Each structure stands twice: as C-alpha cells, then as structure tokens.
Amino acid sequence: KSYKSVALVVGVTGIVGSSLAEVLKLPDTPGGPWKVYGVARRPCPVWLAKKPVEYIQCDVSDNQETISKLSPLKDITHIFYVSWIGSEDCQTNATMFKNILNSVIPNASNLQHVCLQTGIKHYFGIFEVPHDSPFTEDLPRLNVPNFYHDLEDILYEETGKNNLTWSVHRPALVFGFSPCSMMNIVSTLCVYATICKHENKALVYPGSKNSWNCYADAVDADLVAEHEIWAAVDPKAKNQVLNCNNGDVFKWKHIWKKLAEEFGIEMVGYVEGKEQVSLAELMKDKDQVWDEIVKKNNLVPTKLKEIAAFWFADIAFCSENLISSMNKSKELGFLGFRNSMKSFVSCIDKMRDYRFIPAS
Amino acid sequence: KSYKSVALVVGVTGIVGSSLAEVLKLPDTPGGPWKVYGVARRPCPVWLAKKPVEYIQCDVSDNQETISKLSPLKDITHIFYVSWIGSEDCQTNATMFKNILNSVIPNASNLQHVCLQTGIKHYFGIFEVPHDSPFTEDLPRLNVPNFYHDLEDILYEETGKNNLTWSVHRPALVFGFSPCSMMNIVSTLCVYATICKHENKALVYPGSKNSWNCYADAVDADLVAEHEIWAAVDPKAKNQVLNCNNGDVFKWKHIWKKLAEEFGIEMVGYVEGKEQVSLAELMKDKDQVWDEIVKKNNLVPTKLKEIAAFWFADIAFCSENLISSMNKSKELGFLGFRNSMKSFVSCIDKMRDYRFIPAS
Ligand SMILES: NC(=O)c1ccc[n+]([C@@H]2O[C@H](COP(=O)([O-])OP(=O)(O)OC[C@H]3O[C@@H](n4cnc5c(N)ncnc54)[C@H](O)[C@@H]3O)[C@@H](O)[C@H]2O)c1
Numbered sequence: 001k002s003y004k005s006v007a008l009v010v011g012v013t014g015i016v017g018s019s020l021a022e023v024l025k026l027p028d029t030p031g032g033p034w035k036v037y038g039v040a041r042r043p044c045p046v047w048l049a050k051k052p053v054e055y056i057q058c059d060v061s062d063n064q065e066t067i068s069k070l071s072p073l074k075d076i077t078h079i080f081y082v083s084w085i086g087s088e089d090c091q092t093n094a095t096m097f098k099n100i101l102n103s104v105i106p107n108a109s110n111l112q113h114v115c116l117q118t119g120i121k122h123y124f125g126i127f128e129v130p131h132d133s134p135f136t137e138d139l140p141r142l143n144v145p146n147f148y149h150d151l152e153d154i155l156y157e158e159t160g161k162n163n164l165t166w167s168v169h170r171p172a173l174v175f176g177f178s179p180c181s182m183m184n185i186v187s188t189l190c191v192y193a194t195i196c197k198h199e200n201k202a203l204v205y206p207g208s209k210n211s212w213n214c215y216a217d218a219v220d221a222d223l224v225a226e227h228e229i230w231a232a233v234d235p236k237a238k239n240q241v242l243n244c245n246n247g248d249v250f251k252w253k254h255i256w257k258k259l260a261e262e263f264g265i266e267m268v269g270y271v272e273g274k275e276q277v278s279l280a281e282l283m284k285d286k287d288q289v290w291d292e293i294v295k296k297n298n299l300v301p302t303k304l305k306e307i308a309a310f311w312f313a314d315i316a317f318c319s320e321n322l323i324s325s326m327n328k329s330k331e332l333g334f335l336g337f338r339n340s341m342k343s344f345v346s347c348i349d350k351m352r353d354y355r356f357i358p359a360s
Numbered sequence: 361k362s363y364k365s366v367a368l369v370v371g372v373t374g375i376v377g378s379s380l381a382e383v384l385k386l387p388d389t390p391g392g393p394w395k396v397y398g399v400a401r402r403p404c405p406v407w408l409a410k411k412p413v414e415y416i417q418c419d420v421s422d423n424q425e426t427i428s429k430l431s432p433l434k435d436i437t438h439i440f441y442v443s444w445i446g447s448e449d450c451q452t453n454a455t456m457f458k459n460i461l462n463s464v465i466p467n468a469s470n471l472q473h474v475c476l477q478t479g480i481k482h483y484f485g486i487f488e489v490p491h492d493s494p495f496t497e498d499l500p501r502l503n504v505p506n507f508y509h510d511l512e513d514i515l516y517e518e519t520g521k522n523n524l525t526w527s528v529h530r531p532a533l534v535f536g537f538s539p540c541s542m543m544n545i546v547s548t549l550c551v552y553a554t555i556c557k558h559e560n561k562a563l564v565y566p567g568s569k570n571s572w573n574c575y576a577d578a579v580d581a582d583l584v585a586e587h588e589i590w591a592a593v594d595p596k597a598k599n600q601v602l603n604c605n606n607g608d609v610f611k612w613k614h615i616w617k618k619l620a621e622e623f624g625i626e627m628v629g630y631v632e633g634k635e636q637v638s639l640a641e642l643m644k645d646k647d648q649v650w651d652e653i654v655k656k657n658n659l660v661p662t663k664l665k666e667i668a669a670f671w672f673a674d675i676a677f678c679s680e681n682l683i684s685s686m687n688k689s690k691e692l693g694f695l696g697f698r699n700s701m702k703s704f705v706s707c708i709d710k711m712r713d714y715r716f717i718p719a720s
C-alpha cells in the first residue's frame with residue numbers, strides 16, 4: 001500500500017461523499033493515488049460494498065466511538081467533511097464535526113487539510129431576510145442560528161492552531177445519485193415520476209409559479225468532488241471560502257419536461273392561478289407502492305423516506321433568487337463546469353445504471 | 361511585411377471592432393501575427409489614428425465604392441463582420457454584408473473564414489412573442505423581420521459555394537469602450553453619470569422595477585473579440601452558431617451602485633411604485649452641456665448623440681428574461697469568461713484612460 005494521499009470522507013454514503021469515493025479513485029485525480037476511508041452512520045450498504053473504500057460505520061455524534069474508530073488512522077492527509085445530522089440543530093451538527101477533528105488531528109501526523117462542505121443556505125437563511133444575489137463568498141453572515149456558522153468557527157479555530165489549511169465549500173442544490181442522502185432532489189423527482197408512471201398518472205408539477213419560471217442553479221456531485229479535491233491539493237486555493245455550481249442556470253419548467261420525457265409519461269406543467277401543493281403530502285402513503293416497485297424491478301432495496309426527500313423538493317419549488325457566483329473559483333483558475341440539463345439526465349441515467357430506480 | 365493571418369475588420373470604430381483592433385495585435389493571439397485592415401464609414405477618428413491598423417474609410421452600402429476599396433486587398437484571410445447600418449432595415453443591412461463578400465471573395469485567394477456578429481435579438485425579436493431562456497443556439501428563428509436572418513442566409517450561401525468556413529456569434533449586451541458605437545451601454549451610462557455630477561444631481565435610476573431586480577448578462581468587448589478569433593482559427597469551432605457572454609449574471613441594481621461610486625455621486629435606486637421614465641427624454645437638451653464638459657476636460661471631442669445611446673439604455677431597463685447560455689462554447693473548449701462587475705468597471709477605467717469621459 002503506497003499512496004500519495006489518504007482521504008477521510010466523512011459521510012461516504014451521502015450525495016457528495018458517494019461521488020468522492022468514485023472521483024478519488026480516478027487515475028488522473030489531483031493528489032493521487034488516493035487511499036479512501038469512508039465513514040457513515042449505517043452498516044455498509046450493498047451498493048458500496050463493491051467499491052475500493054475502507055468503510056467505517058461510526059456514529060460520529062458519539063465522542064468515545066469516534067475516538068476508538070478514527071484514532072488508529074495515522075496515515076490521513078486530507079479530511080472531507082460532507083455530512084450533517086439531518087436536522088438544523090447547531091449543537092448536534094457541531095458535535096459531529098468537533099469529534100472528527102478531535103479524533104484525527106492528534107493522531108494523523110501528516111494531516112494537511114480540512115474541507116468543510118456547507119451550502120448556499122449561508123446566504124439566505126435556515127429551513128426551520130435574505131441577502132440579494134448573485135451570492136458571493138464575501139457576503140457577511142446573517143443573524144440566524146445557522147449551524148454553518150458553528151462549523152466554520154470550529155474549522156477556523158482548529159486548523160489555525162494546528163497549522164492545517166482549510167476550505168469552505170458552499171455548493172448549490174446538488175444533482176447526484178446516492179439513495180441514502182437526506183436531500184437528493186434528482187432521486188426525489190425520479191421516485192415521484194416512477195410512482196406516477198406506476199399509477200398511470202401524469203407527471204404533474206406541484207410547485208409555485210415563481211419557481212417554475214425563475215432562473216435556478218445546481219451542482220453535479222462529481223463537480224463538487226472535483227472542486228473539493230482541487231481546493232484540497234492546489235496551494236493557490238488554500239484557506240478560501242468557495243461557492244460551487246455548474247456554471248450556468250436553468251429553469252424547473254425545462255427540467256420538468258425532460259423528466260417526463262425520461263419516464264415516458266405525460267407532463268402537466270404549472271397551471272396559471274393554481275397554488276403550490278405539498279409533494280410530501282401527496283406522497284405520504286406511498287411506502288408500500290415504493291416497496292412493490294422495488295421488488296418487481298429487483299432494485300436495490302430502499303425505503304421511501306430514505307431515497308426521497310419530498311419536503312426538500314417542496315422547498316426548491318417555492319424558492320427563487322438563489323443564484324450563486326462562480327467568479328471567485330474561476331478567477332482562482334478552477335474552470336470545471338457542467339451543462340445542468342445534461343447533468344440532470346446523467347443523474348437519472350446513473351441511478352438506473354446502479355439499479356436504484358427502474359430502467360427505461 | 362510577413363504575417364500569418366490578415367484580418368478585415370468591418371466596423372473598426374465599433375464597440376467590438378475597436379477591441380479586435382487591439383486584441384488582434386497581442387503577441388499571443390491565436391493566428392498571429394496578424395495584419396489588420398479596419399473599415400468604417402467615417403474618416404479615421406483621432407483616437408484610432410495611433411493604432412497599427414490600415415484604416416479604410418468606405419461606405420459599405422455603396423457597391424461600387426466597396427469594390428474599388430476592397431478588391432485590391434488580395435491578402436485577406438479572415439473576415440470579421442462587426443457592423444450594422446444603425447437601423448433594423450433588412451434590406452439596407454443585407455446590402456452592406458453582401459457588398460463585403462462580393463468585393464473580397466473573388467479577390468482574396470487565401471480567404472479561409474467569415475465571422476458574422478449578430479446578437480441575442482435572434483431569440484426575442486426586434487426593437488421596432490419571445491423564446492423562453494436560457495437561450496441556446498439551436499432555438500429556431502422567430503417569425504419576424506430580423507435582419508439577422510438575412511445576414512445568416514447570405515453567410516451560409518456564400519461560404520458554402522466558396523468552400524469557406526463560417527461562424528455566427530451572438531453576443532449579449534456589450535460592455536466596451538468605443539465612443540463611436542450606436543449601442544454602447546457603458547459609455548451611455550458614464551455620459552449620464554457625468555452629466556448628473558456636472559449638474560450637482562444624484563444618479564437617479566430611470567428604469568423599470570423588473571430590470572432593477574432581474575438577473576441580466578453581458579459580454580466584455582475584448583471577450584467577444586477573443587471568442588471570434590477562437591472560432592476563426594480553431595478547427596473544432598468551425599461552422600457553428602455560438603453565443604458569447606461573460607459566463608455569469610448580474611443585476612442592474614448592483615451595477616447602479618458601483619456606477620454612483622465610480623463617479624463619486626449619490627445614488628437614487630428604483631423607488632417602489634415609481635414607473636420607468638425615458639432616459640432619452642431626460643437627456644434631449646444636453647448637447648451643449650456635453651460640449652462644455654468635453655472642452656473643460658479636454659476630452660476627445662464627441663457629440664452627445666454619437667457617444668451615448670439613451671434609447672438603448674431605455675430598452676435594457678425594460679428587459680428581463682434574456683439570459684443566454686455559454687454551454688455550447690464551453691463544451692467546444694472555449695473557457696474565456698469575465699467577472700461582469702469587474703468588466704463594467706474596466707470599461708469605465710478604459711474610457712477615462714482614453715480620455716472619452718472625465719477622470720476621477
Ligand atoms: N442538495 C444537497 O444535498 C446539498 C446542497 C447544498 C449544500 N448541502 C449541504 O451539504 C452538507 C452535507 O450534506 P449532504 O446533502 O452532502 O448529505 P447527505 O444527506 O447526502 O449525507 C449525509 C451523510 O452524512 C452521514 N451521517 C449523518 N449522520 C451521521 C452520524 N451521526 N454519524 C456518521 N455519519 C453520519 C450519513 O451517513 C450520510 O453519509 C450539508 O451541510 C448540506 O446542507 C447539501
């Protein structure tokens with residue numbers, strides 16, 4: 001085992017974690033060759049058991065467990081913190097990140113860098129008075145209890161006194177493929193399309209007028225991974241807060257049409273005068289339908305509430321004015337981008353490839 | 361005189377022509393070293409007489425004059441058609457472009473390429489029922505008398521039968537420095553700011569609510585020039601319709617504040633409930649004020665109606681939903697971009713540098 005770099009990917013089953021596990025193993029990836037330790041809360045799921053990552057199940061909110069499991073990992077060079085607890089609680093999110101750092105900083109004598117992933121909520125507030133956009137990295141914090149603030153403060157503190165470099169990545173809405181994410185918009189909409197098709201119903205848009213028509217942006221999970229790796233290895237990027245998006249804008253109206261096409265079903269668009277309804281409510285009783293779809297198509301077994309986050313789709317479909325700028329990253333020399341309409345389709349293709357959702 | 365490439369820049373005093381004349385002479389410019397013939401309607405203005413371009417005054421709507429002046433130019437390799445007549449007339453615009461091609465194609469035995477510059481009006485219509493955006497190059501023509509359609513048809517016809525390559529560039533709103541343009545938004549707003557400051561008045565925004573708040577985009581003139589050169593020399597880009605913008609989005613609200621800062625005057629933003637007023641009307645009697653400003657600051661002499669296009673500012677300030685996509689160009693490998701807030705300021709700096717508008 002000789003490696004140039006050793007990553008600790010905290011949240012390896014997540015929407016970005018799961019791409020890192022793939023992107024870190026590519027032959028041309030900066031910093032490579034990489035060894036990958038992947039940490040997540042659950043036993044290694046079947047869809048990860050066949051990847052070359054050393055999987056560590058660990059409840060990282062438990063300080064003693066995290067110590068016992070991560071303290072022996074002396075060879076770590078780069079930490080990628082791509083997790084959250086699944087609520088907005090400032091204390092319980094902060095405990096996770098502190099336990100990672102407290103377990104690894106004293107034991108990894110060659111640690112170089114800590115990447116912290118937060119998000120564009122930094123600019124507009126919490127889900128539980130926004131800045132105007134396009135959002136830029138220098139915009140000051142809002143006066144709200146955003147766990148992103150605690151995570152940054154811990155990052156700055158700990159990396160400063162231990163002579164480590166740091167980065168803060170603030171991705172836009174993520175287009176990715178993990179069925180174990182707590183916020184995967186593409187899987188959520190694929191599950192809704194799949195259920196519609198199963199019930200011989202049209203793909204009816206449930207959201208607001210404004211979100212149907214406004215400009216939006218997103219980031220491919222593989223591009224977030226590329227961006228995080230870049231900041232982790234390229235000395236010019238060190239110690240910077242950095243937005244991450246696909247470089248372009250789209251509208252949900254265009255995405256919706258593509259989605260109906262991809263599932264071979266009829267689309268119903270936004271209907272003038274019709275108010276947003278809740279997708280979470282429309283789907284409240286669909287667990288067994290999901291289970292049946294799973295079994296017939298011999299899909300990777302997933303439970304409805306895990307694979308889909310209908311509530312997160314409801315938020316996206318009442319949001320507007322959230323565009324974020326990539327000028328800082330581009331001016332630092334990162335010119336990674338994706339065509340968002342193509343990235344959206346790539347995620348659909350991938351989830352079918354991996355058997356999370358039905359083919360065709 | 362040995363040159364690798366010989367450009368004919370039709371509209372060399374224009375907003376993009378004038379950047380080409382600079383960009384073509386840089387040492388690292390693709391295709392270089394370049395010789396530059398620059399054609400425009402007026403005698404060479406003083407601010408161009410000190411550039412290394414062979415300036416040809418020619419009324420290109422006059423077929424016999426164009427023949428007599430351009431037929432002797434046997435060495436042309438690349439044509440850059442960056443002009444228009446200053447109205448929307450399909451016939452008179454088309455005559456200009458046909459006379460260029462009819463004069464040069466039979467006489468330039470090494471001609472390779474013709475670049476045609478049009479614009480994003482292709483997607484939404486004429487100034488005299490738009491597509492939705494983000495605009496992509498494949499969107500079909502609208503059923504309107506757009507002189508861009510005639511120019512393309514002439515381009516396709518003539519390049520096809522003469523085995524020439526072609527490109528169609530569709531820039532967004534141009535940020536540039538030429539004081540002889542018929543549509544220079546930055547100079548127009550600088551002239552308005554300059555007049556406000558002279559009259560001890562605040563920089564009052566005259567436009568619509570929607571345009572104050574909506575996302576907008578633009579292109580730096582130097583980036584259009586880079587893009588046109590790229591398409592003219594890079595075989596992978598050949599025979600393509602291509603949008604050109606800075607790669608990002610901005611809002612006029614943010615620009616306005618920067619503008620007031622740059623002129624050291626107070627800003628009045630959009631005022632809720634207040635309807636758009638016409639900047640052209642507010643400026644109708646300012647010719648002599650402009651003349652006086654010119655003389656005191658020993659500016660390059662310009663007449664108000666030439667340096668500014670208040671009517672074009674009125675259009676921008678009632679437009680929205682006009683964002684254009686750069687995915688095609690990026691997927692073809694062109695990763696040129698600009699920070700639009702910085703490009704806007706760069707244009708202000710440049711126009712002061714060149715003494716078109718007052719310093720400080
Ligand atoms: N669309 C998006 O998902 C999106 C967009 C912008 C920003 N973000 C932000 O990205 C950050 C990371 O979120 P994500 O969406 O990538 O995550 P996710 O919901 O895809 O993944 C959560 C990961 O964290 C792990 N995890 C959760 N609790 C744990 C515990 N107690 N012990 C060990 N592991 C635990 C899970 O096992 C999983 O691997 C968050 O701050 C989120 O708000 C996400």
Ligand SMILES: NC(=O)c1ccc[n+]([C@@H]2O[C@H](COP(=O)([O-])OP(=O)(O)OC[C@H]3O[C@@H](n4cnc5c(N)ncnc54)[C@H](O)[C@@H]3O)[C@@H](O)[C@H]2O)c1
Nearest residue numbers: 371372373374375400401419420442443479534541542543
């Ligand atoms: N903001 C912008 O200015 C902008 C944005 C998008 C697209 N466009 C498009 O770009 C194209 C070129 O316009 P522009 O704005 O670069 O031009 P401009 O108004 O800056 O320049 C016009 C140029 O054409 C020359 N010209 C005009 N009539 C002539 C004649 N009879 N003979 C010789 N020369 C003549 C002028 O001398 C000048 O050099 C147009 O189709 C325009 O609509 C412009």
